[PDB]
Amino acid sequence: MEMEKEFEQIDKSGSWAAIYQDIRHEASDFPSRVAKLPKNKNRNRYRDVSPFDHSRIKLHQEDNDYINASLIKMEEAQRSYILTQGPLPNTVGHFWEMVWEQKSRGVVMLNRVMEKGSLKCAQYWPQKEEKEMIFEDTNLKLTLISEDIKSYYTVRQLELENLTTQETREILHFHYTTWPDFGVPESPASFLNFLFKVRESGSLSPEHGPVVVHCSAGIGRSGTFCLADTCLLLMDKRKDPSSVDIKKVLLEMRKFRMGLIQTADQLRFSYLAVIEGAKFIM
Numbered sequence: 377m378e379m380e381k382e383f384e385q386i387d388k389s390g391s392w393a394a395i396y397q398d399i400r401h402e403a404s405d406f407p408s409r410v411a412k413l414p415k416n417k418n419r420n421r422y423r424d425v426s427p428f429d430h431s432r433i434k435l436h437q438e439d440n441d442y443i444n445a446s447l448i449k450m451e452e453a454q455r456s457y458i459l460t461q462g463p464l465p466n467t468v469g470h471f472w473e474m475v476w477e478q479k480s481r482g483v484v485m486l487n488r489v490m491e492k493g494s495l496k497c498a499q500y501w502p503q504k505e506e507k508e509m510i511f512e513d514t515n516l517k518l519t520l521i522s523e524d525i526k527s528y529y530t531v532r533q534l535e536l537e538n539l540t541t542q543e544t545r546e547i548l549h550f551h552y553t554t555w556p557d558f559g560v561p562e563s564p565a566s567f568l569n570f571l572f573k574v575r576e577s578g579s580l581s582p583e584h585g586p587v588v589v590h591c592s593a594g595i596g597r598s599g600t601f602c603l604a605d606t607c608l609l610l611m612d613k614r615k616d617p618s619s620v621d622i623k624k625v626l627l628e629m630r631k632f633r634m635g636l637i638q639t640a641d642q643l644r645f646s647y648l649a650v651i652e653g654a655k656f657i658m
């Protein structure tokens with residue numbers, strides 16, 4: 377079926393939970409043996425969210441190459457994304473090591489450091505120009521260059537220096553600051569405006585390594601971001617945009633990381649975002 381009318385048909389019939397449970401039943405199951413090794417327990421935020429072995433990102437280190445991060449490679453859309461958990465106190469250096477080694481231009485953050493009165497990820501970037509951060513375990517330096525605070529999101533320019541080679545690179549930090557502590561946004565308008573800002577920066581384009589996207593677990597809000605982007609790109613590329621099947625695209629993405637889209641409300645929000653986004657594109 378088309379999307380917008382499939383949408384109203386699920387609303388009128390109130391069957392979002394049944395649609396979402398079908399997706400969960402059909403999703404891929406692949407091994408995640410490296411994630412479950414005992415030496416990696418303090419590298420995982422949640423025991424039930426792990427990268428598959430076949431698609432995990434490897435650090436270029438011979439001691440321990442493990443990080444909780446997956447490469448989602450979308451062949452028809454010609455987009456790649458790295459989805460990862462919010463960094464932990466003992467993985468902030470690994471996180472920036474990955475950004476460096478994978479040649480990413482942009483980092484997309486969809487959570488606040490504290491939500492619901494608890495810590496959802498480490499404070500992994502500097503908040504003042506004159507107070508830079510040094511990660512001694514991976515030999516990197518990170519400096520805040522500039523910061524632009526808007527009503528729904530903040531953009532930061534950062535300098536990442538590899539202290540071993542003295543090479544430097546400019547990294548863009550796109551921080552969506554207004555996702556509600558509970559539920560999903562009422563309108564997708566500000567999320568779509570944010571996605572377009574990331575696109576306009578060049579961070580999603582083939583002349584750079586894959587964008588790094590995270591929330592707390594790296595599967596819920598993060599899944600919404602890449603699902604909406606890929607679906608909109610396919611609607612632009614194909615002769616018949618109504619052929620784009622968001623449930624099929626989601627199942628393809630779940631071949632590369634488990635659990636993408638965590639609730640039926642996130643599924644409905646993803647439909648809403650693609651539907652509204654397709655009207656603005658034209």
Ligand SMILES: C[C@@H](O)CNC(=S)N[C@H]1C[C@H]2CC[C@@H]1C2
Nearest residue numbers: 452610619620621622624625628
């Ligand atoms: C006519 C409908 O079945 C549309 N099919 C779609 S959108 N397939 C997608 C799933 C993954 C593999 C191919 C694309 C990305």
